[PDB]
Amino acid sequence: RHLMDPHIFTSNFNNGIGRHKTYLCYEVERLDNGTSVKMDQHRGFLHNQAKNLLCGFYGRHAALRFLDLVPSLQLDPAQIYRVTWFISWSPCFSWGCAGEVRAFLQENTHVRLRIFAARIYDYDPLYKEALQMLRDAGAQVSIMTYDEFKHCWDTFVDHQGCPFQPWDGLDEHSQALSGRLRAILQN
DNA sequence: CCATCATTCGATGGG
Ligand SMILES: O=P(O)(O)O[C@H]1[C@H](OP(=O)(O)O)[C@@H](OP(=O)(O)O)[C@H](OP(=O)(O)O)[C@@H](OP(=O)(O)O)[C@H]1OP(=O)(O)O
Ligand SMILES: [Cl-]
Ligand SMILES: [Zn+2]
């Protein structure tokens, strides 16, 4: 029902250009005997609650906003689900975000998590430890390529019929990030 | 409250 402005998608998911915000598009699928049935009702997008020192508020990261909304998803404890995130920045360690996602996965063994990041959040000096902790908790940690960007455009954006138009350098940036993520996950 | 930055889950500066 709720779709993202095209300008907001192309300004926030560009994998060579940073913004001072995080968007997270999410999709939930049920895993059956062999198959997976797509649950169109369980998809949407959100962004971080911005830091706001006028109120003494040091923000709430997009990943923790997703954990906040999990109860409202009303996932049946008797079924197994795969959650996919398409997140403009990779999850941080230093605010405790990777830790809470790990705790979530340990507490909810019927939920399998897949994360595709557009960009690596290395402003956090412990960014490697975040990506390794999520992998160690059983999350698939990946870089967004053309296929994931095009899927997010097609699925989450208010395109009004406009096909995905890849930005210059999309493939080159995806490959370079893919190489940085592989070196981090080798250990 | 915006505007800027060729913008790292905002920091500044101007009014
Ligand atoms: O079932 P297929 O023959 O592979 O059709 C695919 C498939 O459609 P769905 O998204 O409806 O399943 C792609 O998604 P995947 O299942 O392969 O992940 C989709 O890509 P988007 O998710 O990017 O929209 C793609 O694109 P489109 O619907 O734009 O044609 C479409 O067709 P093609 O792969 O033949 O282009
Ligand atoms: Cl985070
Ligand atoms: Zn965080």
Author numbering: 10 to 196
Question: Can I see the authors' text?
Answer:
The normally antiviral enzyme APOBEC3A is an endogenous mutagen in human cancer. Here, we use X-ray crystallography to determine high-resolution structures of wildtype A3A/hairpin-inhibited complexes and demonstrate the underlying mechanism of inhibition.
Surprisingly, they also share very similar conformation of the hairpin loop region’s TT(C/FdZ)G moiety. The superpositions of A3A-E72A in complex with the 3-nt loop, TTC-hairpin (at 2.22 Å resolution), and the 4-nucleotide loops, ATTC-hairpin (at 1.91 Å resolution) and CTTC-hairpin (at 3.15 Å resolution), are mostly similar with an average RMSD of 0.43 Å (ribbon schematics in Fig. 2b and Supplementary Fig. S3c). Larger 4-nt loops extrude one nucleotide to optimally fit around the A3A active site. First, His29 base-stacks with G+1, and T−2 base-stacks with a pyrimidine in the stem (C−3 for the 3-residue loop or C−4 for the 4-residue loop). Second, the positively charged guanidinium moiety of Arg28 forms a cation-π interaction with the nucleobase T−2, thereby further stabilizing T−2 placement for interaction with His29. Arg28 also forms a hydrogen bond to an oxygen atom of the phosphate linking A−3/C−3 to T−2, and the cytosine at position −4 is in register to hydrogen bond with guanine at position +1 as a part of hairpin’s stem. Third, the tight turn between the nucleotide at position +1 and the target cytosine at position 0 is stabilized by a bifurcated hydrogen bond between Nδ1 (amine tautomer) of His29 and O4′ of 2-deoxyribose at +1 and an oxygen atom of the phosphate group that links nucleotides C0 and T−1. Last, the peptide NH group of Lys60 hydrogen bonds to the phosphate linking nucleotides at positions 0 and +1, and the -NH3+ moiety of its side chain forms a salt bridge to the phosphate group linking nts +1 and +2. Our structural studies establish that the stem-loop preconfigures the primary TC recognition motif in optimal position for binding to A3A, such that hairpin DNAs are more reactive substrates and as the 2′-deoxy-5-fluorozebularine derivative is a more potent inhibitor of A3A than linear ssDNA. Both 3- and 4-nt loops present the TC or TTFdZ motif in an identical configuration to A3A.
